[PDB]
Amino acid sequence: EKVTLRISIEGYPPLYEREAQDNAELGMIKPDQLASLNQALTDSYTTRDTNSILRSRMSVSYLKGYTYEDILIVRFRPESEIYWPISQDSRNAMIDKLSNTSVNFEVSLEFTRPAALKHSKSWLVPISLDMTIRAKIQSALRGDPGHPILIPQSIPAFIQVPNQGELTLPTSIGNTIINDARAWFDSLTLNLEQEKMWIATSEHPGDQNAKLWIKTANTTYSGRPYLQVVGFIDR
């Protein structure tokens, strides 16, 4: 079973690329994790907001439609699997294009062991025409240390894998996160950290310590947080 995350400027080779291949990178959800997710969704309603009750119940019953062996904890190692930049990742091309519509880019790709085998989705995030912000991205690509690449609302902490075509969102859960692509997406941050690779960290919208989030773990080998996606698989 294979899952792949790619973060890039649209049209160019990834700045960050990592596959996740039970063990640390791919595991089923633990019963305590499933329960803590459900309690988070259940208790998310405010009494005098009837809408929040409806939203929390659509969330609770969406979750109930999955056995815990259909809920994968997918963890991507934050270090890109390959150095940057090598023969050509189009560094100068990217830098020159930022100087026009340009779009940040992340893909999720899910392979399942022997329905169809391959299911994917791309998320585009328009880079502002403000040259102030495009300058910082440029010098970051130029290998200037202490210059991160911020890609807000770019990656979902929860994804749904269907038997049919492309990946979809758990929209009810997304709505619980919003009120109680979209505003509930995690934001990515890329750092070129001194043979040279980009390293990715993510942050939830709102409080990191919100109970809804299944907390990620840190890698043994580098002590860095795993990028994490929780996947709801449709059997």
Query: Which residues are bridge partners to 218 per DSSP?
Result: 225
- 148 close to 127: Cβ distance less than 8 angstroms: no
Sequence ranges of the domains in the chain: 1-235
Helix (H) / strand (E) element for 107: namely strand 102-111
- How far apart are the C-alpha atoms of 197 and 132, rounded to whole Å? 25
Cα 34 to chain centroid, rounded: 19
Number of H helices, E strands in the chain: 5, 11
The 10 Å CB-count burial string (b at 16+, else e) for 131-152 is eeebebbbebbeeeeebebebe
* Entry resolution (Å): 2.5
Experimental technique for the deposited model: X-ray
Which one-letter amino acid corresponds to residue 226?
A: Y
Calculate the alpha carbon distances from 49 to 44, 52, 108, 180, 210 in Å: 11, 5, 35, 10, 20
Breaks in the chain (C to N over 2.5 Å), named by the residue before each, are 21, 99, 114, 180, 194
Query: Which residues are bridge partners to 159 per DSSP?
Result: 231
